[PDB]
């Protein structure tokens, strides 16, 4: 993209109903950070997700470390909060040659003061004057009456910690719903009545596949036993019900 | 000291017979709880206290038993 | 758009929800089991506001709503969801399948009384301006008839974690004036991928009146024990927080309770006030003499200033933009102002 | 175009003269200042308007009648009860920050012949 | 109270270098956003540069980058400018302008240019 | 399709500065490894510098470092050269040469110099 969002007003694109080939993104040499939480970066192409969100913004070089679970700081607390149980990968690369200008690029803004911390994935795009003291501001800046946003002065002569970095955060949601985003795996022929290792749309285990007599409703994709372990699956290609 | 607390026990005949129940707030004074009967185990609400003794059916404690009659 | 005013202005009426409002809480098949789930459910015997006349004001939408209609000539058309519903925020429009089953999360400028009209359709007076379309889904074309009871329609509308979830059930009915007693569960119909802030809603109806009524209930976080039969159909349920017998049933994981004594929960008096007491000190801590200092010490011979007998306002130091590192060990940096040392 | 400002306008005595200093799309979220320059003398500060409100000032040789409002990308300076003392050159500038002051793009200026 | 005054007017042959001072009297110096501006005779004001003495860094406009040198001497509470390669169009009156500071002082929260120089 | 053409031939007396353009028509510009080369009359080719427009950085040879300035103007899809302190030996034909790009584009995976300029 050529028009990344500001971190105080970050963009979100939702990706669904497609094949996600992560070997191109992972095997790319163009990214400087690819740190994954909840999943490993080299096994990503074998998994399936419900939907994936791609959040994007520009931050300061020293601030790349704050885009992680369990971090504190002006960005982590007032601009983009990531949850502690986050499943996903945080991707960042140096973009000084695109986002920096000689006199300084001031189109990238961040929120500096806020009454309270953000909740995970919460946005705040208001421009309300921040109350630092006890005296009402009545809409006017001054001491203890502050404007909540500030810009990053990106210049080509700044040190590495002060250079612009473009950050894309891919959030991987795992809920009991039809999967729409899957890695570039090839399928094999279905084998019944034999001891096999199976992977049914991300559901893995070892067992023997037989014809089921369970009356699944049109929306149910798999079943569980009294023990709350998987014991039935709807095949993702032919809408056949199998017992496992 | 902490605020008054205690367990809640439901005194009941089986659902084969009736859906009426009584609730025992164990070792909690009647006043702070909200047919109110004060006993050693606490104040038992929903059971009618009678002076006629019978065989123990549902035990309450400290000599008190309950039954459906 | 038409503002229907030929409405008697009476307070809301109320009826008994009985055993209505149970839906399949998940997408997993189970049978011959009792499963306890904590989710947003319509409480059993919850009082339900009852609308007819031409009865349809704007209603609150809190955690979610339960919608059911008893009709003979298919008067319900859809629902309006949004925050202000006047193009200031994103809104959801669901039209009847007569044109097409359609959920449009486009930015619409709505009327202060949107509706559809009819017996043949002519008018489409739901919204005026409409641009900034972000999501659309259209179900395979069908048709919603525009002209004791026999047909019961049940709906649940939720807006949770980026999904607008619609559940529905189709059943026979036999009451004249109420919600039946007996049990049915609402299966999910469609999962709408819309991360929308929904707080208010309005009902679309299709001047004269048809034979219809609708009911609105509200969902709360509750724990329900659901009974799955041999075919995996939910056949019964107990709302364990309704009364102590349902609570006993939930604790014992059974719908039958034997004669006996059961320990099912714990009663606790809740606090009603927050009492905060700290000493009568008003002098500020001498932090400023160390942070704005002009003669910092060498690290081999570092300086130490001891700060005592003062009020330490850490929101000035923490909320300062001038520091590049503020890493705390043993305490959190954002709760520091509530502590004493 | 950066800061676009009309070359000259002329208003009668006791009337309202709304002066438009527009902000370009690239220079959208920048602080805006306003200055009064007497003919042949150095410009002096009048009022400063931010994107969130008014900076606030007083006692800078500016009459109480002067006021400034900022709506959208256009900054308006409003003069009420104008007299012959207000004939001057007015300039509006841009600004930016976070440790390097950046630059101020000054518009052409307005010659308000009363 | 606080005011900024500089040296008088200089006249130079084209192609030479001109050095302009700016004295500061009153207030807490080195927190001010000292700025340098100019206006051609009959033309609107044009920026050239600015400097914050405490940060010791100087910013310049693209039109004047590589030709204007600005320094701030904290010891004398003064701000200096050096301009070289003067041309015919470069002749104009030169102003030294300041800004009040408030807030964290590392992030731009400043008042207007309330006080100006007397010209150069 | 894609081709690079520059301005005509210039003659300068020694000690002056020469600026040579290079226009780009067709293809996806700023991904090309634009290079500057020269060959003395009767002598083999000698490199002097190169530039990748998207990275905005310029590389120069040791023989010409501090004397050759190369810039790439992405807006006009053009590449510019500035050479100063010309001497007697510096006279030669000047070529603007490109390279196809493939791969991650941050790490060198490039084709040959398939397309050349017409001389300068
Ligand atoms: C670090 O130091 C700065 C500067 O303070 C000075 O240096 C220190 C070491 C001591 O010697 C001080 O005595 C020196 O003054 C401090 O910034 C100051 O903060 C204080 C509050 O803590 C400010 O006092 C306020 O002033 C308000 C009115 O002034 C306003 O208008 C003027 C212009 O007229 C403007 O310059 C000023 O910034 C305000 O906008 C008043 O309404 C309010 O109630 C309060 O009295 C003081 O003005 C600040 N000075 C500046 C220039 O910012 C830092 O607080 C200090 N930090 C730490 C952690 O010690
Ligand atoms: C692809 O999947 C669909 C069900 O979604 C099935 O009907 C169809 O036969 C499958 N085709 C192939 C290529 O197996
Ligand atoms: C319960 O509270 C009432 C009112 O204070 C008091 O009279 C009574 O003695 C208490 N009983 C017990 C068991 O403490
Ligand atoms: C039961 O005993 C109590 C206490 O002695 C007495 O007050 C009451 O009259 C008796 N009779 C009944 C059956 O309530
Ligand atoms: C919606 O579209 C109109 C016309 O392009 C535009 O002016 C308006 O800003 C847009 N609003 C949103 C929410 O993008
Ligand atoms: C949701 O809408 C309500 C309407 O009152 C509003 O107060 C609230 O701030 C909105 N929240 C978000 C996250 O948009
Ligand atoms: C379940 O399905 C079977 C076969 O369709 C049917 O005979 C039976 O009546 C159904 N009901 C139950 C729960 O047994």
Q: Which long-range contacts (CB under 8 A, 24 or more apart) does F23-27 make?
A: F23/F76, F23/F77, F23/F78, F24/F77, F24/F78, F24/F79, F24/F98, F25/F77, F26/F1, F26/F2, F27/F1, F27/F2
In a domain, residue D12? The reply is yes
- Separation of alpha carbons A83 and A85, rounded Å: 5
Which DSSP string do the residues of F35-100 spell out, in sequence order?
EEEEE-TTS-EEEEEEEETTTTEEEE-TTTTTTEEEEEETTTTEEEEEE-S--STT--EEEEE---
Query: Are residues A238 and A244 in contact, defined by beta-carbon separation less than 8 angstroms?
Result: no
Report the candidate in E57, E65, E60 with the shortest Cα–Cα distance to residue E49: E60
- Separation of alpha carbons F103 and A77, rounded Å: 37
Q: Per the structure block, which two tokens stand in for E92?
A: 């104009």
Q: Write the residue in E59, E65, E108 that is nearest to A150 by C-beta.
A: E108
Does residue C84 have its Cβ closer than 6 Å to ligand 6? no
Report the candidate in A45, A52, A38, A49 with the shortest Cα–Cα distance to residue A83: A38
Report the candidate in D74, D72, D79, D80 with the shortest Cα–Cα distance to residue D92: D74
- Separation of alpha carbons C188 and C229, rounded Å: 18
- The helix or strand, by DSSP H or E, that contains position A98, with its residue range, turns out to be helix A96-99
- Separation of alpha carbons F109 and C8, rounded Å: 78
Nearest-CA distance A131 → chain F (Å): 43
- Separation of alpha carbons A90 and A171, rounded Å: 9
- The helix or strand, by DSSP H or E, that contains position A24, with its residue range, turns out to be helix A22-26
Which DSSP string do the residues of E17-44 spell out, in sequence order?
-EEE--EEESS-TTSS-EEEEEE-TTS-
Which atom of ligand 7 lies closest to the CA of C235? Answer: 13
- Separation of alpha carbons C73 and B51, rounded Å: 62
Distances (CA, A) of B51 to B30, B35, B38, B54: 20, 15, 14, 10
Query: Are residues A241 and A200 in contact, defined by beta-carbon separation less than 8 angstroms?
Result: no
Taking one residue from A and the other from F, the number of pairs with CB-CB distance under 8 angstroms is 14
Q: Which residues contact C316 (CB under 8 A, 6 or more apart)?
A: none
Q: Write phi, then psi, for A163 (nearest 5 degrees).
A: -85, 155
Q: Which ligand is nearest to the CA of C88?
A: 5
Q: Per the structure block, which two tokens stand in for A197?
A: 């290792």
- Residue given tokens 């449009």 in the structure block: C104
In a domain, residue D1? The reply is no
CA C18-C19-C20 angle, 5° bins = 100
SS (H, E, C) C234-279: EEEEEECCCCHHHHHHHHHCCCCCCCEEEEEEEEECCCCCCCCCCC
Checking chain F for breaks where C and the next N are over 2.5 Å apart, the residues before them are: none
Q: Write phi, then psi, for C96 (nearest 5 degrees).
A: -70, 155
Residue A233 three-state SS: strand
Please indicate if any CB of chain A lies within 8 Å of the CB of D99: yes
In a domain, residue D3? The reply is no
- Separation of alpha carbons E45 and E84, rounded Å: 20
Taking an 8 Å cut-off on Cβ atoms, the answer to whether F57 and A97 are in contact is yes
Q: Which long-range contacts (CB under 8 A, 24 or more apart) does E74-78 make?
A: E74/E29, E74/E30, E76/E23, E77/E23, E77/E24, E77/E25, E77/E29, E77/E30, E78/E21, E78/E22, E78/E23, E78/E24
Residue B53 three-state SS: coil
Distances (CA, A) of B23 to A119, B28, B42, E18: 41, 12, 10, 96
- Separation of alpha carbons E118 and E97, rounded Å: 10
Query: Are residues A180 and A48 in contact, defined by beta-carbon separation less than 8 angstroms?
Result: no
The total number of structural domains that make up chain D: 1
- The residue of chain A with its CA nearest to that of D55 is A141
Nearest CA to ligand 3 atom 2: B31
- The residue of chain C with its CA nearest to that of E109 is C321
User: What count of other Cβ atoms lies within 10 Å of the Cβ of residue C264?
Assistant: 19
Taking an 8 Å cut-off on Cβ atoms, the answer to whether A217 and C191 are in contact is no
| Residue spans of beta strands (DSSP E) within chain A | 11-15, 18-19, 33-37, 48-49, 52-60, 88-94, 109-111, 130-131, 145-146, 149-151, 164-172, 181-182, 195-200, 203-208, 210-211, 222-224, 230-234, 241-243
Q: Write the residue in E52, E112, E117 that is nearest to D45 by C-beta.
A: E112
Task: Give the range of the structural domain holding residue D47, as residue numbers without chain letter.
Answer: 8-112
Which residue of C85, C197, C198 sits with most ligand 6 atoms within 8 Å of its CB, as the best mutation to test the pocket? C197
Which residues in chain A have Cβ-Cβ distances shorter than 8 Å to F55?
97
DSSP letter at E101 equals B
Q: Which residues contact C171 (CB under 8 A, 6 or more apart)?
A: C152, C154, C184
Within chain A, what is the greatest distance between any pair of CA atoms?
Answer: 77
**The length of chain C, given as a count of residues:** 341
- Separation of alpha carbons C109 and C90, rounded Å: 10
Domain boundaries, chain C: 13-268
Helices marked H in chain C — which ranges? 244-252, 288-291, 314-318
Burial label for A98, CB within 10 Å (0-12, 13-18, 19+), is: middle
Which atom of ligand 5 lies closest to the CA of C132? Answer: 1
Query: Are residues A142 and D87 in contact, defined by beta-carbon separation less than 8 angstroms?
Result: no
- Separation of alpha carbons D40 and D35, rounded Å: 14
In a domain, residue D2? The reply is no
Nearest CA to ligand 3 atom 7: B31
User: What count of other Cβ atoms lies within 10 Å of the Cβ of residue C166?
Assistant: 19
The chains in contact with chain C, meaning 3 or more Cβ pairs closer than 8 Å, are: A, B, E
- Give the torsion through C-alpha atoms of A140, A146, A152, A153, to 10 deg: 60
Nearest-CA distance D114 → chain A (Å): 31
Cα–ligand 2 centroid distance for A232 (angstroms): 20
Residue range C13-268 forms a domain whose CATH class is mainly beta
Mutation pick from C26, C27, C316 vs chain A, by most beta carbons of A within 10 Å, is C27
Q: Per the structure block, which two tokens stand in for A87?
A: 């499943």
Q: Which residues contact ligand 7 via a Cβ below 6 A?
A: C 229-231
């Amino acid at each position: 993209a050529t028009r990344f969002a500001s971190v105080y007003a970050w963009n979100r694109k939702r990706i669904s109903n497609c094949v996600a080939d992560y070997s191109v993104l992972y095997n790319s040499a163009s990214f400087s950070t690819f740190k994954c939480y909840g999943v490993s970066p080299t096994k990503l192409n074998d998994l399936c997700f419900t939907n994936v969100y791609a959040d994007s913004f520009v931050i300061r070089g020293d601030e790349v470390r704050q885009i992680a679970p369990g971090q504190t700081g002006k960005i982590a607390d007032y601009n983009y909060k990531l949850p502690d149980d986050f499943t996903g990968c945080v991707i960042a690369w140096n973009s000084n040659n695109l986002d920096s200008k000689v006199g300084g690029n001031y189109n990238y803004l961040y929120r500096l003061f806020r009454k309270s911390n953000l909740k995970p994935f919460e946005r705040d795009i208001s421009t309300e004057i921040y109350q630092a003291g006890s005296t009402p501001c009545n809409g006017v800046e001054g001491f203890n009456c502050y404007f909540p946003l500030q810009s990053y002065g990106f210049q080509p002569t700044n040190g590495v910690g002060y250079q612009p970095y473009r950050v894309v955060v891919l959030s991987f949601e795992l809920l009991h719903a039809p999967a729409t985003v899957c890695g570039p795996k090839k399928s094999t022929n279905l084998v019944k009545n034999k001891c096999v290792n199976f992977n049914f749309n991300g559901l893995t285990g070892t067992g023997v596949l037989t014809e089921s007599n369970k009356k699944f409703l049109p929306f149910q994709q798999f079943g569980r036993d009294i023990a709350d372990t998987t014991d039935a699956v709807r095949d993702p290609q032919t809408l056949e019900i199998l017992d496992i | 000291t902490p605020c008054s607390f205690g367990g809640v026990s439901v005194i009941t005949p089986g659902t084969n017979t009736s859906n009426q129940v009584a609730v025992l707030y164990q070792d909690v004074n009647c006043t702070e709880v909200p047919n109110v009967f004060q006993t050693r185990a606490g104040c038992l609400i929903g059971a009618e206290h009678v002076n006629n003794s019978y065989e123990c059916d549902i035990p309450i404690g400290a000599g008190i038993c309950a039954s459906y009659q | 758009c038409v503002n229907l005013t030929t409405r008697t202005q009476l307070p809301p009426a109320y009826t008994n929800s009985f055993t209505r409002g149970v839906y399949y809480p998940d997408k997993v098949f189970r049978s011959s089991v009792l499963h306890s789930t904590q989710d947003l459910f319509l409480p059993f015997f919850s009082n339900v506001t009852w609308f007819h006349r031409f009865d349809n004001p704007v209603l609150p939408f809190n955690d979610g709503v339960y919608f059911a209609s008893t009709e003979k000539s298919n008067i319900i058309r859809g629902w309006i969801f949004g925050t202000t519903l006047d193009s200031k925020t994103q809104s959801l429009l669901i039209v009847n399948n007569a044109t097409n089953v359609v959920i449009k999360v486009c930015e619409f400028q709505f009327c202060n009384d949107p509706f559809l009209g009819v017996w043949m359709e002519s008018e489409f007076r739901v919204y005026s301006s409409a641009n900034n379309c972000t999501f659309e889904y259209v179900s395979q074309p069908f048709l919603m008839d525009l002209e004791n009871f026999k047909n019961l329609r049940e709906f649940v509308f939720k807006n949770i974690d980026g999904y607008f979830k619609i559940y529905s059930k189709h059943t026979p009915i036999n009451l004249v004036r109420d919600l039946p007693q007996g049990f049915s569960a609402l299966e999910p119909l469609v999962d709408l991928p819309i991360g929308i802030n929904i707080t208010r809603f309005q009902t679309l109806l299709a001047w004269t009146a048809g034979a219809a009524a609708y009911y609105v209930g509200y969902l709360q976080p509750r724990t329900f024990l659901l009974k799955y039969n041999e075919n995996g159909t939910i056949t019964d349920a107990v709302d364990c927080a309704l009364d102590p017998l349902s609570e006993t049933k939930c604790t014992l994981k059974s719908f039958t309770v034997e004669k006996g004594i059961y320990q099912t929960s714990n009663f606790r008096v809740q606090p009603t006030e927050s009492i905060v007491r700290f000493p009568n000190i008003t002098n500020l801590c001498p932090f400023g003499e160390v942070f704005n200092a002009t003669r910092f010490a060498s690290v081999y011979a570092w300086n130490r200033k001891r700060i005592s007998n003062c009020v330490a306002d850490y929101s000035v130091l923490y909320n300062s933009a001038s520091f590049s590192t503020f890493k705390c060990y043993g305490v959190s940096p954002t709760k520091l102002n509530d502590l004493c040392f | 175009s950066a800061l676009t400002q009309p070359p000259s306008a002329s208003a009668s005595l006791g009337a309202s003269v709304t002066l438009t200093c527009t902000l370009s799309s690239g220079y959208s979220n920048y602080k805006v200042d306003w200055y009064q320059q007497r003919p042949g003398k150095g410009p002096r500060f009048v009022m400063r308007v931010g994107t969130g409100g008014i900076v606030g000032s007083k006692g800078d040789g500016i009459p109480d009648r002067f006021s400034v409002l900022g709506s959208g990308l256009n900054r308006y300076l409003t003069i009420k009860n104008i007299q012959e003392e207000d004939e001057s050159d007015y300039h509006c500038g841009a600004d930016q920050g976070s440790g390097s002051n950046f630059v101020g793009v000054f518009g052409g200026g307005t010659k308000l012949t009363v | 109270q606080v005011q900024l005054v500089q040296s008088g007017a200089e006249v130079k042959k084209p192609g030479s270098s001109v050095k302009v001072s700016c004295k500061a009297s009153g207030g807490t110096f080195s927190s001010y956003a000292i700025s340098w501006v100019r206006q051609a005779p009959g033309q609107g004001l044009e920026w050239m540069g600015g400097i914050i003495p405490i940060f010791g860094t100087a910013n310049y406009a693209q039109k004047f980058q590589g030709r204007v040198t600005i320094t701030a001497d904290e010891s004398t509470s003064t701000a200096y400018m050096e301009l070289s390669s003067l041309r015919s169009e470069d002749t104009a009156v030169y102003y030294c302008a300041r800004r009040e500071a408030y807030g964290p002082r590392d992030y731009y929260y400043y008042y207007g240019m309330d006080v100006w120089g007397q010209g150069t």
